[PDB]
RNA sequence: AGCAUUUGUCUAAAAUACUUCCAUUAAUCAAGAACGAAAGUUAAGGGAGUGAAGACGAUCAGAUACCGUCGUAAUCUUAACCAUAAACUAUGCCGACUAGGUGUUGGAUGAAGUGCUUCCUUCAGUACCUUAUGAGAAAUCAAAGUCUUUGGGUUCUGGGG
RNA sequence: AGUCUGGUGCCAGCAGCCGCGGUAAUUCCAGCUCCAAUAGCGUAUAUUAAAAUUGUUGCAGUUAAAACGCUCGUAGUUGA
């Protein structure tokens, strides 16, 4: 209830640095005198809610696909795949991925899944040319340019990514059948990162 | 519409092609005009009524 | 024929799931399959088959220390004469390689064009719905509508793309310098282009848009 | 003859080679904080996306459809 | 000298579905790859068994780039299995 | 000097609609302007517009509709016979269907189609589409 | 155009601020006028260095040139004149509207380093970087955009070599 | 609408323009066939369209031609 909250807040998810983002100051709280941003996260929540709802409004989780070039994100993606069978791409982005009808890589999916905008950057952009909406764990000083849903995360930290992550498969898992949303889901957490 | 020179030079206009025959019963207003085909203007020549009737056999012919 | 589409969207076609061109037209999908346009197209059933035209091949050269490299680019011109106009180009280095590629080009770039009236209904859309103006290079060029019985003009160019998009009265105009033609039919399709893009009043009214083919076909999706 | 999709955000037309734009489906849910079947739709153009614009667009049709709490 | 592409191919094939029957011996080595691989050539056999060979030594050593072993694969699955005030004051200034 | 401040209002609208912000906020206001406004909603264009009180000039605010597709000014407002009336249009409207050109005449600002009907000339005062 | 030693004197200037005054005085402007680098002219100084002209030594096929050494006129000041320069933001000037960020110079507003100093917010200048389903022939241009979807105001200029 | 048949051979010559002609000429001189318009068709000169290439509609002036060296300013034009 305020626990999924404070866990949020317990992990350095709030701590935005370095620029604002002029678009991302709405969920921005305050700028600290220390040079960091201060991030709403409440609304942060709900959006994630607002993302699992269009990710179970996508009726085959395949169809879905997974990116992080991050490579502490990578094992954080693979993760959320063995949950929920949405693709992972990790390592070396593809551009024809997307946009190369034969290629051997090749994916036509519904909904793409995005770490961060700005390391995860040229998929996105390919992305929008092969009109997929992309959802985006954004940061500060990461771009907001060809993302429909927005969820506002520290990108730089492991444990926000994981976190994110974490909320999102037991949100997805609540609105799917697997697991009544009174009970806590509890299938091997907080195992989600490596060296 | 309902200016009057136009629905007078209009009914006239109109009145002279069915005079003409070149708007027969089926078409009967000013954006049938604008239907009017070269063809239909050139089954007007005698040659063609001639031909058509079957007094000669052949529009040379006729 | 034989037949086998690489991506799952051209199998709904293949497989009749998808019933006609509108559809993918209208959730605006990209294609990258000319089995899709050949399934649409067909010489019988459909009511009006595309008809294609070579509209102009030209020579073109890399030039070397030694030899020329001499390439071709050819540019096609498709409609079926009642709605869908194409206007396809390649650059390769043998002829009829090149016709071949143009004509895939075409294909891909197969467009719905809209038509209105001049005036009051007369139950046939027959000129463009209104003045639409399209760029490239130098050579802007616009279509202007007109009332019936007042034919297409305009360079042979342009008489043909306007006879593909099955427009039968229209104004034309240009503005530059002429000449250049692969830029001109490239800015005579620009123009034809937006004329079904353009908004008018009769879309003022708000109205549902269907669920996507990616989800009405999910499961025969996930099949195969 | 048909009539083509109109951007949710901008109310703006959307062509058919334009090749950018989505249509975002949104999950209803039941009172107990599960999926319902029934699932709410809106189309976003790849303009809006282009100039980034989006996601506060989608944060106000969320509001008018009652979907959001917080409008901005 | 080097190795080209079609020797480092063969190589990362082997190793892939043949780990368990490589060992550190060159000699033994020529004599793998030819039960394994109906190499064409002596020359082109060695060079697949010198390279196979010096993978054998940088495998153990470190993971290597570009191939799998099954094992590893089970091993890594295996393997990975209010608050304080200087952590308060952001909290605080949300409420 | 100030220059013609239907003209740069309108551009600022035409602008806000180009943008899709869909509403606008009028530095300057006018008795004209306001009744341009008007027509525009008069024609289905605009929705509600504020016109807020500052003792030198008001403001005003308008909604967009997602609606217009240009709004433009005849500068300056040129005089012009009935039947001259026929080739501005001609020359102007992207539709004969649809746009509208809007002139001045004794009975105040309005269409093409009224002061025809009217059979009054005018002033020629702006366009939109 | 152009303007860099020190201090003084006589002067102008813009922004900021203003619950100060006026009440449309304005904008751009044929005609006309002012100012206008370097060189040139004319006169007085002054005339060191530099140094158009000019003189030699070379260099070199020759070299009257680059290069070396010398060196008048000029460069400097006062007093008159002269009125052109790639006198180039090769972008007339005023007007509005458009998109962000990094800076930066001059003020005002708030807060905290120790009245002063810093930082925050905001103005008038001023550059850069990225973005332009904006523009353009592209280079590029936040203007060269908002211009066949062509009329914010106005001056000047061009019509193949 | 002809890589048609012979002759000339950077000559003779033709051809609004591009060009053709230095030995196998698809342009010259013949012959043949074909094509366009037709009791009319060539030729010159002048003129309109062509030319949104003089631009009210409706031009252009960073780099292609073109912003007065600069500012003030009367007439001028424009006027919250």
Redesign the interface.
């Given at each position: 209830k305020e626990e999924s909250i404070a866990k949020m807040l317990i992990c350095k998810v709030h701590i935005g640095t370095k620029n604002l983002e002029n678009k991302m100051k709405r969920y921005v709280y305050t700028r600290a005198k220390d040079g960091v941003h201060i991030i709403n996260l409440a609304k942060t929540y709900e959006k994630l809610q607002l993302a699992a709802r269009i990710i179970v409004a996508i009726s085959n989780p395949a169809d879905v696909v997974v990116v992080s070039a991050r490579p502490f994100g990578s094992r954080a993606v693979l993760k959320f795949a063995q949950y929920t069978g949405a693709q992972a791409i990790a390592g070396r982005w593809t551009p024809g991925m997307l946009t190369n009808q034969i290629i051997q890589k090749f994916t036509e999916p519904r909904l793409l899944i995005v770490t961060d905008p700005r390391t995860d950057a040229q998929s996105v952009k390919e992305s929008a040319y092969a009109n997929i909406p992309v959802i985006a764990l954004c940061d500060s000083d990461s771009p907001l340019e060809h993302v429909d849903i927005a969820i506002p995360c520290n990108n730089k930290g492991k444990e926000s990514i994981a976190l994110m992550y974490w909320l999102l498969a037991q949100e997805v898992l609540y609105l799917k059948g697997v697991i009544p949303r009174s009970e806590p889901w509890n299938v091997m957490v907080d195992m989600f990162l490596w060296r | 519409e309902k200016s009057s020179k136009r629905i007078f030079q209009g009914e006239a206009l109109l009145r002279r092609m069915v005079r003409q025959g070149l708007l027969g019963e089926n078409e009967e207003k000013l954006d049938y005009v604008l239907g009017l085909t070269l063809p239909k203007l050139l089954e007007r020549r005698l040659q063609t009524k001639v031909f058509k009737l079957g007094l000669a056999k052949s529009v040379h012919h006729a | 024929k034989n037949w086998v589409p690489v991506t799952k969207l051209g199998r709904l076609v293949k497989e009749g799931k998808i019933v006609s061109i509108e559809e993918i037209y209208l959730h605006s999908l990209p294609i990258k399959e000319y089995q899709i346009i050949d399934y649409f197209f067909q010489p019988n059933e459909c009511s009006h088959p595309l008809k294609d035209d070579v509209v102009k091949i030209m020579p073109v050269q890399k030039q070397t220390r030694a030899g020329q490299r001499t390439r071709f680019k050819a540019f096609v011109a498709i409609g079926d004469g009642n709605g869908h106009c194409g206007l396809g180009v390649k650059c390769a280095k043998e002829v009829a390689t090149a016709i071949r590629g143009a004509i895939i080009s075409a294909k891909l770039s197969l467009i719905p064009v809209r038509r209105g009236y001049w005036g009051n209904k007369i139950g046939d859309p027959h000129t463009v719905p209104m003045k639409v103006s399209g760029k490239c290079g130098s050579v802007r060029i616009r279509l202007v509508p007109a009332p019936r019985g007042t034919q297409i003009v305009g360079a042979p160019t342009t008489k043909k793309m306007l006879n593909f998009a099955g427009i039968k009265d229209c104004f034309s105009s240009s503005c530059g310098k002429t000449k250049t033609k692969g830029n001109f039919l490239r800015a005579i399709f620009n123009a034809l282009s937006k004329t079904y893009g353009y908004l008018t009043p009769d879309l003022w009214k708000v109205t549902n848009f269907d669920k996507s083919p990616y989800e009405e076909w999910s499961d025969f999706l996930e099949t195969y | 003859?048909?009539?083509?999709?109109?951007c949710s955000?901008?109310?703006?037309?959307?062509?058919?080679?334009?090749?950018?734009?989505?249509?975002?489906?949104?999950?209803?849910?039941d009172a107990?904080?599960?999926?319902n079947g029934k699932?709410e739709?809106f189309?976003?153009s790849?303009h809006?996306?282009?100039?980034?614009?989006?996601?506060?667009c989608?944060n106000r049709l969320?509001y008018e459809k009652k979907?959001?709490?917080?409008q901005? | 000298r080097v190795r080209t592409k079609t020797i480092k191919r063969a190589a990362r094939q082997i190793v892939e579905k043949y780990y368990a029957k490589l060992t550190l011996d060159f000699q033994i080595n020529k004599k793998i790859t030819e039960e394994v691989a109906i190499i064409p050539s002596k020359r082109m056999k060695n060079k697949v068994a010198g390279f196979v060979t010096h993978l054998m030594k940088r495998i153990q050593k470190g993971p290597v780039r570009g191939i799998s072993l099954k094992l590893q694969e089970e091993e890594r699955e295996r393997r990975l299995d209010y608050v304080e005030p200087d952590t308060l004051r952001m909290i605080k200034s949300l409420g | 000097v100030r220059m013609s401040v239907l003209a740069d209002c309108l551009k600022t609208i035409n602008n806000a609609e180009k943008r899709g912000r869909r509403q606008v906020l009028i530095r300057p206001s006018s008795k004209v302007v306001i009744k341009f406004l008007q027509y525009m909603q008069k024609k289905g264009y605009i929705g509600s517009f504020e016109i807020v009180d500052d003792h030198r000039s008001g403001k005003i605010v308008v909604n967009l509709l997602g609606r217009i597709n240009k709004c433009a000014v005849i500068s300056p407002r040129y005089d012009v016979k009935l039947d001259e009336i026929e080739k501005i249009i001609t020359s102007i409207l992207p539709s004969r269907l649809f746009g509208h050109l809007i002139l001045t005449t004794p009975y105040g600002i309005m269409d093409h189609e009224e002061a025809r009907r009217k059979h009054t000339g005018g002033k020629v005062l702006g366009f939109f589409f």
């Amino acid at each position: 209830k305020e626990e999924s909250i404070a866990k949020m807040l317990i992990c350095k998810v709030h701590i935005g640095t370095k620029n604002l983002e002029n678009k991302m100051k709405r969920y921005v709280y305050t700028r600290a005198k220390d040079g960091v941003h201060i991030i709403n996260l409440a609304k942060t929540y709900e959006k994630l809610q607002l993302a699992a709802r269009i990710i179970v409004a996508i009726s085959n989780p395949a169809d879905v696909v997974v990116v992080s070039a991050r490579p502490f994100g990578s094992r954080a993606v693979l993760k959320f795949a063995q949950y929920t069978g949405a693709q992972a791409i990790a390592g070396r982005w593809t551009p024809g991925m997307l946009t190369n009808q034969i290629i051997q890589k090749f994916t036509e999916p519904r909904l793409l899944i995005v770490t961060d905008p700005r390391t995860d950057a040229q998929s996105v952009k390919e992305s929008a040319y092969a009109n997929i909406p992309v959802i985006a764990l954004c940061d500060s000083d990461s771009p907001l340019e060809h993302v429909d849903i927005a969820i506002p995360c520290n990108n730089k930290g492991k444990e926000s990514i994981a976190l994110m992550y974490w909320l999102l498969a037991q949100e997805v898992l609540y609105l799917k059948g697997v697991i009544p949303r009174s009970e806590p889901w509890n299938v091997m957490v907080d195992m989600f990162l490596w060296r | 519409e309902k200016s009057s020179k136009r629905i007078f030079q209009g009914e006239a206009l109109l009145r002279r092609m069915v005079r003409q025959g070149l708007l027969g019963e089926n078409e009967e207003k000013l954006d049938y005009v604008l239907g009017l085909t070269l063809p239909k203007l050139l089954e007007r020549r005698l040659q063609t009524k001639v031909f058509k009737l079957g007094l000669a056999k052949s529009v040379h012919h006729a | 024929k034989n037949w086998v589409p690489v991506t799952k969207l051209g199998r709904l076609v293949k497989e009749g799931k998808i019933v006609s061109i509108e559809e993918i037209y209208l959730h605006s999908l990209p294609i990258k399959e000319y089995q899709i346009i050949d399934y649409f197209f067909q010489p019988n059933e459909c009511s009006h088959p595309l008809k294609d035209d070579v509209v102009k091949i030209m020579p073109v050269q890399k030039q070397t220390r030694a030899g020329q490299r001499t390439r071709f680019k050819a540019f096609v011109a498709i409609g079926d004469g009642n709605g869908h106009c194409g206007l396809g180009v390649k650059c390769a280095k043998e002829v009829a390689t090149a016709i071949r590629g143009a004509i895939i080009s075409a294909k891909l770039s197969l467009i719905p064009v809209r038509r209105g009236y001049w005036g009051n209904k007369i139950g046939d859309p027959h000129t463009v719905p209104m003045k639409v103006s399209g760029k490239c290079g130098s050579v802007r060029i616009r279509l202007v509508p007109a009332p019936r019985g007042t034919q297409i003009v305009g360079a042979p160019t342009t008489k043909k793309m306007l006879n593909f998009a099955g427009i039968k009265d229209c104004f034309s105009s240009s503005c530059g310098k002429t000449k250049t033609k692969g830029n001109f039919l490239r800015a005579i399709f620009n123009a034809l282009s937006k004329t079904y893009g353009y908004l008018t009043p009769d879309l003022w009214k708000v109205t549902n848009f269907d669920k996507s083919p990616y989800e009405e076909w999910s499961d025969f999706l996930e099949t195969y | 003859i048909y009539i083509p999709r109109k951007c949710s955000a901008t109310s703006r037309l959307i062509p058919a080679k334009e090749h950018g734009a989505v249509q975002i489906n949104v999950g209803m849910v039941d009172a107990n904080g599960v999926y319902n079947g029934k699932t709410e739709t809106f189309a976003i153009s790849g303009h809006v996306r282009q100039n980034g614009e989006s996601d506060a667009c989608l944060n106000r049709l969320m509001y008018e459809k009652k979907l959001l709490s917080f409008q901005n | 000298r080097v190795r080209t592409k079609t020797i480092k191919r063969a190589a990362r094939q082997i190793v892939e579905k043949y780990y368990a029957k490589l060992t550190l011996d060159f000699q033994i080595n020529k004599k793998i790859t030819e039960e394994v691989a109906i190499i064409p050539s002596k020359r082109m056999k060695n060079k697949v068994a010198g390279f196979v060979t010096h993978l054998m030594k940088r495998i153990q050593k470190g993971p290597v780039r570009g191939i799998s072993l099954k094992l590893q694969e089970e091993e890594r699955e295996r393997r990975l299995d209010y608050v304080e005030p200087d952590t308060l004051r952001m909290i605080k200034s949300l409420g | 000097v100030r220059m013609s401040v239907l003209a740069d209002c309108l551009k600022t609208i035409n602008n806000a609609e180009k943008r899709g912000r869909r509403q606008v906020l009028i530095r300057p206001s006018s008795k004209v302007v306001i009744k341009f406004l008007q027509y525009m909603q008069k024609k289905g264009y605009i929705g509600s517009f504020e016109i807020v009180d500052d003792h030198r000039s008001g403001k005003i605010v308008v909604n967009l509709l997602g609606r217009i597709n240009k709004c433009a000014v005849i500068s300056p407002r040129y005089d012009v016979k009935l039947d001259e009336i026929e080739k501005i249009i001609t020359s102007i409207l992207p539709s004969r269907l649809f746009g509208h050109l809007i002139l001045t005449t004794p009975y105040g600002i309005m269409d093409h189609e009224e002061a025809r009907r009217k059979h009054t000339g005018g002033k020629v005062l702006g366009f939109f589409f």
